[PDB]
Amino acid sequence: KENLIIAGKAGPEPEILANMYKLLIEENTSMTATVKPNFGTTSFLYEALKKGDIDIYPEFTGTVTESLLQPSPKVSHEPEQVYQVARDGIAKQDHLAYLKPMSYQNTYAVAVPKKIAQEYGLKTISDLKKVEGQLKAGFTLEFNDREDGNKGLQSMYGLNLNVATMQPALRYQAIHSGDIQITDAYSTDAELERYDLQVLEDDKQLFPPYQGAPLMKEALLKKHPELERVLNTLAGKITESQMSQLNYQVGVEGKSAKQVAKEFLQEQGLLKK
Numbered sequence: 001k002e003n004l005i006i007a008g009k010a011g012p013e014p015e016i017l018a019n020m021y022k023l024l025i026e027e028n029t030s031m032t033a034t035v036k037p038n039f040g041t042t043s044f045l046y047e048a049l050k051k052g053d054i055d056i057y058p059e060f061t062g063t064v065t066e067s068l069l070q071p072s073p074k075v076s077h078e079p080e081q082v083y084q085v086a087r088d089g090i091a092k093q094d095h096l097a098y099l100k101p102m103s104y105q106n107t108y109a110v111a112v113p114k115k116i117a118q119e120y121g122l123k124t125i126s127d128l129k130k131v132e133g134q135l136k137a138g139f140t141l142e143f144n145d146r147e148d149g150n151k152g153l154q155s156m157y158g159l160n161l162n163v164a165t166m167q168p169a170l171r172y173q174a175i176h177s178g179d180i181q182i183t184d185a186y187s188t189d190a191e192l193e194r195y196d197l198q199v200l201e202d203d204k205q206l207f208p209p210y211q212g213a214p215l216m217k218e219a220l221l222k223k224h225p226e227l228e229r230v231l232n233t234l235a236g237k238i239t240e241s242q243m244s245q246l247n248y249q250v251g252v253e254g255k256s257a258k259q260v261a262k263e264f265l266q267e268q269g270l271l272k273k
């Protein structure tokens with residue numbers, strides 16, 4: 001009875017996904033699983049998977065192509081083609097099996113409050129160049145370090161924003177309290193609707209498609225080939241409205257994310273009872 005270490009990045013959403021994995025593995029295989037919530041950021045999840053410290057983690061397709069793949073391929077904005085380059089690229093580079101993606105897109109999103117976008121005429125990311133000497137931005141450290149992040153805001157848009165580096169769990173409160181007026185939101189985050197935040201349109205298309213999918217070593221899939229069929233029951237499933245409600249239940253209502261993942265997969269017929 002092997003026990004697989006399933007970890008996630010920071011936030012309720014990868015903890016929900018890791019528990020969804022654990023529920024499907026424990027029911028449909030002879031293995032158990034342990035969920036490591038908020039295990040780290042993208043690179044730490046990536047190097048722990050290659051080092052064998054963790055077994056599965058939900059990785060996003062544009063994050064493979066931009067951060068994990070070196071040199072980064074020039075991909076399209078079609079999510080199926082971004083997945084195919086990410087799956088073939090991460091198998092070529094690090095021998096990691098990238099299973100089939102989910103339906104929803106959880107992208108990076110430049111978000112300002114609803115008052116600020118109407119006060120300053122902000123509708124797209126290019127509109128931040130009008131006002132970049134006025135508002136203060138609060139970004140996560142990884143978004144600052146990423147070429148599909150604040151570095152791409154500098155490179156593709158010309159935006160040299162007044163950026164304060166933030167922890168991920170404190171950026172939504174600070175945009176709510178008014179200490180910052182720009183933050184790196186995630187598309188399926190419940191704090192977008194909870195804090196009246198208006199997502200600015202990616203008019204120059206800096207951000208690639210970002211669909212989540214299980215990422216694991218190829219050797220683990222060769223040892224356990226049932227892991228492919230079991231976890232691909234989530235493939236092409238879970239909408240943006242469904243995932244944002246799961247983040248609302250765990251992150252805001254304080255529900256246990258193993259329970260939140262269990263009721264959802266039972267409601268969709270993906271889990272027993």
Ligand SMILES: C[N+](C)(C)[C@@H](Cc1c[nH]c(=S)[nH]1)C(=O)O
Pocket residue numbers: 009010040041042060063106107108142168186187210
């Ligand atoms: C889904 N996403 C928005 C595209 C990001 C979110 C994220 C980046 N770093 C951490 S931690 N979370 C990612 O996982 O790459």
